[PDB]
Design a binder for this molecule. Structure first.
Ligand SMILES: Cc1c[nH]c2ncnc(NCC3(O)CCSCC3)c12
Ligand SMILES: [Cl-]
Length: 167
């Protein structure tokens, strides 16, 4: 039993809700919140910009130190940093950005990072401003993630389409 509430159950391990991931994290304080990161951990917009804003820019300050030490992430890769006031940890995961020409096949590699964590609150990787088809992202999620994932979909119209079209 966990404290996630109001989710529709898609499979044994994948759950979904129309919710603002920022407000969800603040309520649940999950062990892991996933950020839709880029390789530079520049949290300017989309999910990343919203999560960072909710931390009063502390996420960005921490991220800049991470990059200065370690260099950029790989597309498909991740790192674990603090969850600040939102979660114990933030798993920064880089899905391919179609608006940069990145290979959509890397979306599966991106979701594989979730399997290192027993339970996660997450957005759909590569959705929104990363330009991929969210229906495809949900399919890859269900077919790749084996741990317990609670997906927050900000857009109500999109949430309804994802549910109604789910096979
Ligand atoms: C931008 C943003 C702020 N807070 C959020 N919580 C969750 N998801 C988000 N954007 C990604 C999205 O859910 C992918 C699937 S379709 C709708 C968009 C956001
Ligand atoms: Cl977005």
């Amino acid at each position: 039993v966990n404290s996630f509430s109001g989710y529709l159950k898609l499979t044994d391990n994948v759950y979904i809700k129309n919710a603002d991931i920022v407000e969800e994290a603040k309520k649940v304080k999950p062990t892991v919140v996933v950020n839709a990161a880029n390789v530079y951990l520049k949290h300017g917009g989309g999910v990343a910009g919203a999560l960072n804003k909710a931390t009063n820019n502390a996420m960005q300050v921490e991220s800049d130190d991470y990059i200065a030490t370690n260099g950029p992430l790989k597309v498909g890769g991740s790192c674990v940093l603090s969850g600040h006031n939102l979660a114990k940890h933030c798993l920064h995961v880089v899905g391919p950005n179609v608006n940069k020409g990145e290979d959509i096949q890397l979306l599966k590699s991106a979701y594989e990072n979730f399997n290192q964590h027993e339970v996660l609150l997450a957005p759909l990787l590569s959705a929104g401003i990363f330009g991929a088809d969210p229906i495809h992202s949900l399919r890859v999620c269900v077919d790749t993630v084996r741990t317990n994932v609670y997906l927050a979909v900000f857009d109500k119209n999109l949430y309804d389409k994802l549910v109604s079209s789910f096979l």
